[PDB]
Design a protein around this motif. Sequence first.
Motif, mmCIF file in Angstrom:
data_model
loop_
_atom_site.group_PDB
_atom_site.id
_atom_site.type_symbol
_atom_site.label_atom_id
_atom_site.label_comp_id
_atom_site.label_asym_id
_atom_site.label_seq_id
_atom_site.Cartn_x
_atom_site.Cartn_y
_atom_site.Cartn_z
ATOM 1 N N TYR A 108 0.822 -1.208 0.000
ATOM 2 C CA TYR A 108 0.000 0.000 0.000
ATOM 3 C C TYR A 108 0.858 1.261 0.000
ATOM 4 O O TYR A 108 0.518 2.251 -0.660
ATOM 5 C CB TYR A 108 -0.945 -0.005 1.201
ATOM 6 C CG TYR A 108 -2.173 -0.865 1.012
ATOM 7 C CD1 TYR A 108 -2.847 -0.889 -0.203
ATOM 8 C CD2 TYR A 108 -2.664 -1.649 2.050
ATOM 9 C CE1 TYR A 108 -3.972 -1.674 -0.381
ATOM 10 C CE2 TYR A 108 -3.789 -2.437 1.881
ATOM 11 C CZ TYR A 108 -4.438 -2.444 0.664
ATOM 12 O OH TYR A 108 -5.557 -3.225 0.491
ATOM 13 N N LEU A 125 0.924 4.141 -2.834
ATOM 14 C CA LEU A 125 0.796 5.560 -2.511
ATOM 15 C C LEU A 125 1.900 6.381 -3.172
ATOM 16 O O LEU A 125 1.650 7.485 -3.679
ATOM 17 C CB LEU A 125 0.819 5.749 -0.994
ATOM 18 C CG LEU A 125 0.766 7.180 -0.457
ATOM 19 C CD1 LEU A 125 -0.509 7.880 -0.900
ATOM 20 C CD2 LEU A 125 0.897 7.191 1.058
ATOM 21 N N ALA A 150 1.004 6.731 -6.770
ATOM 22 C CA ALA A 150 -0.048 7.728 -6.942
ATOM 23 C C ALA A 150 0.510 9.144 -6.858
ATOM 24 O O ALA A 150 0.087 10.029 -7.612
ATOM 25 C CB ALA A 150 -1.146 7.516 -5.901
ATOM 26 N N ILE A 170 0.423 11.970 -9.773
ATOM 27 C CA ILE A 170 -0.033 13.317 -9.443
ATOM 28 C C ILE A 170 0.956 14.354 -9.959
ATOM 29 O O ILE A 170 0.568 15.329 -10.607
ATOM 30 C CB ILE A 170 -0.251 13.448 -7.922
ATOM 31 C CG1 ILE A 170 -1.607 12.866 -7.525
ATOM 32 C CG2 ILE A 170 -0.172 14.905 -7.468
ATOM 33 C CD1 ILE A 170 -1.816 12.761 -6.030
ATOM 34 N N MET A 181 1.088 14.369 -14.110
ATOM 35 C CA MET A 181 -0.073 14.958 -14.752
ATOM 36 C C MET A 181 -0.428 16.337 -14.197
ATOM 37 O O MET A 181 -1.108 17.106 -14.886
ATOM 38 C CB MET A 181 -1.201 13.920 -14.706
ATOM 39 C CG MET A 181 -2.124 13.883 -13.539
ATOM 40 S SD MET A 181 -3.497 12.894 -14.153
ATOM 41 C CE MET A 181 -4.433 12.637 -12.669
ATOM 42 N N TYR A 192 -2.163 3.449 5.598
ATOM 43 C CA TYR A 192 -1.552 3.519 4.271
ATOM 44 C C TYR A 192 -2.586 3.331 3.165
ATOM 45 O O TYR A 192 -2.540 4.026 2.141
ATOM 46 C CB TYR A 192 -0.439 2.479 4.150
ATOM 47 C CG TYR A 192 0.914 2.974 4.610
ATOM 48 C CD1 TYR A 192 1.530 4.051 3.983
ATOM 49 C CD2 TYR A 192 1.575 2.366 5.669
ATOM 50 C CE1 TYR A 192 2.768 4.509 4.400
ATOM 51 C CE2 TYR A 192 2.813 2.816 6.094
ATOM 52 C CZ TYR A 192 3.404 3.887 5.455
ATOM 53 O OH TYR A 192 4.635 4.337 5.874
ATOM 54 N N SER A 193 -3.530 2.403 3.356
ATOM 55 C CA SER A 193 -4.593 2.209 2.374
ATOM 56 C C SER A 193 -5.497 3.434 2.284
ATOM 57 O O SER A 193 -5.925 3.818 1.188
ATOM 58 C CB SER A 193 -5.407 0.963 2.720
ATOM 59 O OG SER A 193 -6.348 0.669 1.702
ATOM 60 N N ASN A 208 -4.561 6.544 2.903
ATOM 61 C CA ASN A 208 -3.794 7.568 2.196
ATOM 62 C C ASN A 208 -3.749 7.295 0.694
ATOM 63 O O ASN A 208 -3.808 8.233 -0.113
ATOM 64 C CB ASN A 208 -2.383 7.658 2.772
ATOM 65 C CG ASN A 208 -2.371 8.140 4.210
ATOM 66 O OD1 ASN A 208 -3.341 8.731 4.686
ATOM 67 N ND2 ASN A 208 -1.271 7.888 4.910
ATOM 68 N N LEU A 209 -3.646 6.021 0.303
ATOM 69 C CA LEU A 209 -3.695 5.667 -1.115
ATOM 70 C C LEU A 209 -5.048 6.014 -1.730
ATOM 71 O O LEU A 209 -5.118 6.517 -2.860
ATOM 72 C CB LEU A 209 -3.389 4.179 -1.290
ATOM 73 C CG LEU A 209 -3.658 3.551 -2.660
ATOM 74 C CD1 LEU A 209 -2.746 4.149 -3.721
ATOM 75 C CD2 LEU A 209 -3.504 2.039 -2.600
ATOM 76 N N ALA A 262 -5.161 9.740 -2.216
ATOM 77 C CA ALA A 262 -4.360 10.136 -3.370
ATOM 78 C C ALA A 262 -5.079 9.832 -4.680
ATOM 79 O O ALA A 262 -5.050 10.643 -5.615
ATOM 80 C CB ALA A 262 -3.000 9.442 -3.327
ATOM 81 N N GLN A 263 -5.743 8.675 -4.762
ATOM 82 C CA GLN A 263 -6.510 8.345 -5.962
ATOM 83 C C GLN A 263 -7.709 9.275 -6.133
ATOM 84 O O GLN A 263 -8.084 9.617 -7.264
ATOM 85 C CB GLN A 263 -6.959 6.885 -5.911
ATOM 86 C CG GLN A 263 -5.825 5.889 -6.109
ATOM 87 C CD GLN A 263 -6.128 4.527 -5.518
ATOM 88 O OE1 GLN A 263 -7.039 4.378 -4.703
ATOM 89 N NE2 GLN A 263 -5.362 3.522 -5.927
ATOM 90 N N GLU A 315 -7.730 12.446 -5.167
ATOM 91 C CA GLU A 315 -7.133 13.669 -5.707
ATOM 92 C C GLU A 315 -6.830 13.526 -7.196
ATOM 93 O O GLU A 315 -7.017 14.477 -7.972
ATOM 94 C CB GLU A 315 -5.857 14.018 -4.941
ATOM 95 C CG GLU A 315 -6.074 14.355 -3.478
ATOM 96 C CD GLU A 315 -4.899 13.947 -2.611
ATOM 97 O OE1 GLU A 315 -3.858 13.536 -3.168
ATOM 98 O OE2 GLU A 315 -5.020 14.029 -1.371
ATOM 99 N N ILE A 316 -6.347 12.343 -7.599
ATOM 100 C CA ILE A 316 -6.108 12.032 -9.009
ATOM 101 C C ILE A 316 -7.379 12.225 -9.826
ATOM 102 O O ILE A 316 -7.377 12.908 -10.857
ATOM 103 C CB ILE A 316 -5.562 10.596 -9.150
ATOM 104 C CG1 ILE A 316 -4.096 10.521 -8.723
ATOM 105 C CG2 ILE A 316 -5.789 10.033 -10.551
ATOM 106 C CD1 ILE A 316 -3.580 9.109 -8.556
ATOM 107 N N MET A 352 -8.577 16.197 -9.872
ATOM 108 C CA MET A 352 -7.962 17.083 -10.850
ATOM 109 C C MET A 352 -7.859 16.465 -12.246
ATOM 110 O O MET A 352 -7.537 17.194 -13.186
ATOM 111 C CB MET A 352 -6.629 17.660 -10.325
ATOM 112 C CG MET A 352 -5.570 16.752 -9.761
ATOM 113 S SD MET A 352 -4.849 15.633 -10.930
ATOM 114 C CE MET A 352 -3.730 16.722 -11.807
ATOM 115 N N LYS A 353 -8.231 15.189 -12.436
ATOM 116 C CA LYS A 353 -8.624 14.732 -13.772
ATOM 117 C C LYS A 353 -9.870 15.458 -14.257
ATOM 118 O O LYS A 353 -9.957 15.851 -15.429
ATOM 119 C CB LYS A 353 -8.894 13.225 -13.785
ATOM 120 C CG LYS A 353 -7.698 12.338 -14.033
ATOM 121 C CD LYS A 353 -8.071 10.870 -13.925
ATOM 122 C CE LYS A 353 -6.865 9.972 -14.140
ATOM 123 N NZ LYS A 353 -7.203 8.547 -13.882
#
Lengths: 426, 426, 439, 193, 48, 48
Positions: free
Chosen positions: E16, E20, E23, E27, E30, F16-17, F19-20, F23-24, F26-27, F30-31
């Motif tokens: 994980y 992260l 990811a 970020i 892109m 950690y999961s 936070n991942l 992050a996804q 946020e991906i 802003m996509k």
Amino acid sequence: MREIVHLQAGQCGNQIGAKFWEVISDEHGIDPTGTYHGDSDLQLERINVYYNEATGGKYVPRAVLVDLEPGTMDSVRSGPFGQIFRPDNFVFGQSGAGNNWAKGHYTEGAELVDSVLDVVRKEAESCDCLQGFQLTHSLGGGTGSGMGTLLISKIREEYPDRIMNTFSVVPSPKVSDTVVEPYNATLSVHQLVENTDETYCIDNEALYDICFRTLKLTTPTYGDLNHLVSATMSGVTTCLRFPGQLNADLRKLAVNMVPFPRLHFFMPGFAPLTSRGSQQYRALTVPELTQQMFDAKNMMAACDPRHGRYLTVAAVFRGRMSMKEVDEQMLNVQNKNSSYFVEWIPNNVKTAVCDIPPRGLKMSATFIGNSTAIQELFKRISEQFTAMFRRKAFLHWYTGEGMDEMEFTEAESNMNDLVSEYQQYQ
Amino acid sequence: MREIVHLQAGQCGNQIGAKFWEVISDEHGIDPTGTYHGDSDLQLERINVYYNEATGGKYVPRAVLVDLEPGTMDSVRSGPFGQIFRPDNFVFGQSGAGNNWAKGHYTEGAELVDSVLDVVRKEAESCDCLQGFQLTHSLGGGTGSGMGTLLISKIREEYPDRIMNTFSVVPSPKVSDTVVEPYNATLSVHQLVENTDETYCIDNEALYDICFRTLKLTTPTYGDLNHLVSATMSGVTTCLRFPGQLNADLRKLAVNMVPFPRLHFFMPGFAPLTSRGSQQYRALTVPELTQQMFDAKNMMAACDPRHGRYLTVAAVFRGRMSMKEVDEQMLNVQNKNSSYFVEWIPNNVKTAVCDIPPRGLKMSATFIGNSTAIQELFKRISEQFTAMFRRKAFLHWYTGEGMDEMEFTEAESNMNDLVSEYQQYQ
Amino acid sequence: MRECISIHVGQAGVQIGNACWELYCLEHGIQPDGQMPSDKTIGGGDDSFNTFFSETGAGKHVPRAVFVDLEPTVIDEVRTGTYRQLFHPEQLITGKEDAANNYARGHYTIGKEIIDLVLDRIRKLADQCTGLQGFLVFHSFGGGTGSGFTSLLMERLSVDYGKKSKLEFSIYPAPQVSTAVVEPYNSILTTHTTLEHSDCAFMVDNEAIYDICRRNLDIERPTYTNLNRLIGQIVSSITASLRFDGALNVDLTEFQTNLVPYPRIHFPLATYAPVISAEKAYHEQLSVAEITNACFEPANQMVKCDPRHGKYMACCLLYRGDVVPKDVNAAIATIKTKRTIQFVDWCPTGFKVGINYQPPTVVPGGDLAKVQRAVCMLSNTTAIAEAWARLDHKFDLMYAKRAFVHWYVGEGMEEGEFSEAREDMAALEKDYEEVGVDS
Amino acid sequence: EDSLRNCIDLKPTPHRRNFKKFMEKNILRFFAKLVTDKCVDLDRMFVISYYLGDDTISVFEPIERNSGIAGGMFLKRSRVKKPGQEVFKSELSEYIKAEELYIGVTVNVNGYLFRLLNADEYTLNYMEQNTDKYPFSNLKLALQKLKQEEGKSRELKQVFKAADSKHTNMVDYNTFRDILMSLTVGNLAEQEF
Amino acid sequence: QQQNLYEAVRSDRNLYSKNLVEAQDEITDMKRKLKIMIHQVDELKEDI
Amino acid sequence: QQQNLYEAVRSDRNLYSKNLVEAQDEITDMKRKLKIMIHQVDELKEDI
Ligand SMILES: Nc1nc2c(ncn2[C@@H]2O[C@H](COP(=O)(O)OP(=O)(O)OP(=O)(O)O)[C@@H](O)[C@H]2O)c(=O)[nH]1
Ligand SMILES: Nc1nc2c(ncn2[C@@H]2O[C@H](COP(=O)(O)OP(=O)(O)O)[C@@H](O)[C@H]2O)c(=O)[nH]1
Ligand SMILES: Nc1nc2c(ncn2[C@@H]2O[C@H](COP(=O)(O)OP(=O)(O)O)[C@@H](O)[C@H]2O)c(=O)[nH]1
Ligand SMILES: [Mg+2]
């Protein structure tokens, strides 16, 4: 390019894989020493799929050899093609599972899978572009049914974006070589249906019937039955390592034969099968191959396909041969046997054509098929399980290793759902 | 030219240096007579680094052979390579120490240290441009640990601007071959950490792990164990003797591995170790070499780097190759193992390549790595010292020879302060 | 460059030393005449005999030991027997009147008149050898010469040579049987000398040899002439690393520091294994694990105590023969696993090994079989306090009626040493229980 | 011999030495000298001992008075490799000097050439008692090698009588050497002699 | 049982953390693409 | 001790999961921003 990892568990899986690694070595012209001695160069362009390069021109097979009882690995090394296997790929325990799913899964097969997983992961990173997994075992035993379904579980949770092609030798009623295998069959199809994408059911009564009436041999030893299985082993993926005019890999077979996440139980076939005394009187033609792929006599599972309806059928052809005769006869068998296929989906037949036939033959055809006649394969195991769990017999061997009795009820409940869905869609 | 002076103290040091002076005699092409018998000419361009030239085309090793009992001197002189060592290079005593650091450091070792200075200072001043020193001794013995630590402090007081590296033999957690070795070793490392530039911790039990598991041998005699020690001894100064794409001395490795004067404990390893049956099937390839580097099985110290984390890593490579997969694969293991490296310093790993591989081999590589996981070695001998010293155990052998109890407490206090700052960079 | 000197005291010492030196003849191939056999006309094969045998320009090898006893009768059988020409005419010291099972006769009145004659030859054997580790003492507790004369010999040797090593092999009294009556008097009153004037002291009990020779070698009714072969087999495995080459050599100084943790604690214990007959040899495989397990087994223990009731402080492995170091470590790591064997909590590393290459030799007519590997124990444990407790209880009830006192007082010594020897031991037994007490 | 087992078996087994040979097996001792170019420091007489158990050769030099070198031992119970080289990747098991040592055979041990000159009396008794292994100790074959020249056997009697001037049965070993080499047959080896 | 569960969960935690990091890399890359075509927005505004 | 280590490592893995997943998210967010300003690019190109 597209590498396939072969896993062997149980005594049945070890013997079939020892025959499987012999046929494709003969097809690619590899002597038992480990070098290459062939005539055509097309057997060398696609060699990394099944074999790994080593220094000095020596080719080694990418395979994993696992069994708790070390009895069968002495026979594997003492066989004709046993020198090629790596001694680091011979992972074994100390005591056998004793025809128990409990000892094969949770006590004795629970600490060896750490050693199996490190060999598998090491060989996985050695491959350039991994394509999937193929595995062979038996459901009616302790090591193959136990650690096989365990290894299916542990690899699927670590490699999600791959495929599993399981070749399971399902037990037969009259050829019942065990008395407890209804327990092991029900407790392994629970782990099979949720973590496999393509499963090939193989029976012994079907193979004994074929070698009597089709091949006409009076001494069908296990060195011959495994050869019939190994033909379908090498013919399912012959478009992945050879040229052709219409190529198809294992993922294309998966998306053309599995419409639903739970209807993925197949039935294999191979039909340029003739006797020695009748070779002179038969015309090796596309009509005669097409005729004998589809009869009930040539199926490698103990099921009558005419008692049910097919959903999807795929055929893989080999040889320099036409295409109109393929497309007409695959259309002709759909039109003639219209009542033998379901009417809510058209074009049930997938065709793939290759270039190179195997050694000592002119043209070949490998049959794989999804059908709803596997209901009769699982109904007998249902009645065996219900009549056997009713008196709680053969149970102290299972509750004395950690598992509760509720898992037996869950395995019957999952399997009853599996026979519900095939009958609903028939 | 930069020449290496070898120091060889103790019985254990004699048994590993006899093998050390065998393989570089084998590699340089030195017969047991003393002449040269080889094929090429680039083996002779830099041979003064280990060999002194004399009349008749003869070469003697640039080594001093030191012990207190004379039993093992007849052992050295009558071995397979016993007639190449100089007869005047043997310094011997009469009354042995017998597993006591106190007799070796204050009473018995106080007189032979002056005679062996006169041997080494006569030899060292004759070198044109002396590169540095190297040492082999055992911490569990009376001679190598008692008096070899006197030599360490004394030649450091006489030759300040030099480099000295020690192949120290630390005790094993279970194999322990003394009852009083915490008294023999903890006071040695008190005198070692002040006056040493590089320290290689070589443990016996790790060699037993390598030979049984990696090489699959059943009777590992000390001659078999000492080859593995001697393999990494010759494997660190390869670029000193032979040309390459990027050379490296012992000074160049020291300035990249130790960032602070009290962090100089390493953890050696050797890559090409493969079992005999697995020799023909394993492809000797640069990713295969670096795969067997960072595995905790390969290491020659009784420590687990997973329990700690690395600080600096050195790799010295042999054999004509590309620098691409040495450069690419060390970046990969730096990126995959993000939690197994320090984060307050980048690019922790140093590259060195040499053109000539050892005999019978194509590529080879040597691991030199500082780690915090060696605190587990120091804490393990700390609790053994604490659980022995509090009740004045074995003390009349130590307080009856002059040294007081404040030396023992400072031997603890320097060591606990050493592991205190080991924790802080973790 | 290496030499060893042995001093054998008493009738026990001169009789175990005969079997000790015939084996030393057979390991180096010395004939009873004293030379290499005349069939071999060129010699000097290896200088392993230099530590046990002297060198003469005529080719004769002379041993480096001295035999002392007050009884001439057992001494002159060496002068009369097969080995008359081998042993030196002077190296066998003869008395005239025996001490007769007493301490004062051997110490104060007869031991004085021959203590100067032996010391002349001890000095003569000391300047022959360039390097000497120390002296081995083969004495007996129950003997008059082995108690009284030895209690002045170790005292004078300690000031004759200061830091020289002192090893003792003592014939300890058996806890059940004994050949005499006043042996607690002879045992206690010599302990005051030996506790301060000795470095190490292995104890040998005869009745434990009796049962071991009976039940293991399948020989019923043994004799002293084969027990001394067993003791002489123990002495060769200790000095094997000095003479013969090995993977790692153990010195005479190495184990004297590794088995004596305190100056008052210097009583280790010996054990030898395997001890099997020729008929039993070929049926049973003899692995390193199967010969080191019997050593820690108290059934094969050679002094009549039990380490299960006690606790070890130190041990010493003497591996001799076809042995590889890999399964040595697997054996000792397996020994650390059983909780039946209990160590103290303050000596967590209690092991020292010694490896020798050459397998042991056998004698014609001996009881032991031709063996390829063997191991000898030198282990220190507190179970000797069990043996000491039952020895003083017999001493205290015997002294309570003041029996046999007139045999000692009138010889010249005072009666105050009786109370001091009982009290000095009582402090020693207090020291024995205090080291056994953990924190 | 330890690493054969990796391909003999999948799981290795400890190497089994010859219990039978160790059980029945004394020491065969030969006198040897060092053979190199003409150097004045090297006139040293060594003794070679074959142990007949583990098939092992140990060479030792006795200490000689007022000599500039004192070498107590040359090799310590270690087997000897013949000078044929081929050290690595040898498919067969390695070659080791077996127990075939005559009088006059120059043996190459560790690069040092050693000429055998004499044997101990036990060694020569072994030579004459065991002859299926050693055809050079046959008296019958030794005299058959002399019987090939019966034409000169008559002249040999006057050759002996020329040396027998005092009418005795009394001749020297060096004389009995020089007639048997003045035959110039070239087939009389030193062991047969 | 506790050791096996702890090792499996630790391996999943490391996986994980690596995902992260991946990811974050996506970020950043892109985001750079976003800045590039923001400059394109400014250029086309100047075009108008 | 093993239970405490396993529970702490499980909490770290869940962190950690999480936070991942953040992050996804946020991906994806802003996509959506990227595609919105790409539509803006198309609009002012039509203006040009
Ligand atoms: N194990 C063993 N013990 C022996 C042997 N010979 C004598 N002993 C012991 O010696 C004890 C008898 O004392 P001795 O040694 O004969 O007496 P001594 O030393 O000659 O002293 P005196 O009789 O006063 O001259 C017996 O109890 C035996 O246990 C022997 O050959 N082997
Ligand atoms: N057709 C065929 N069946 C086999 C072969 N070897 C084993 N079997 C089947 O495997 C079953 C026994 O499986 P078993 O060895 O006990 O499984 P395991 O104990 O888990 O390894 C029997 O019913 C056999 O019919 C073979 O070579 N060919
Ligand atoms: N790795 C290795 N260790 C050895 C060797 N020989 C001895 N030792 C170790 O050295 C220790 C004994 O050292 P010792 O002989 O007392 O050292 P010295 O007194 O200074 O000569 C033992 O614990 C052995 O484990 C060898 O050849 N290789
Ligand atoms: Mg007497």
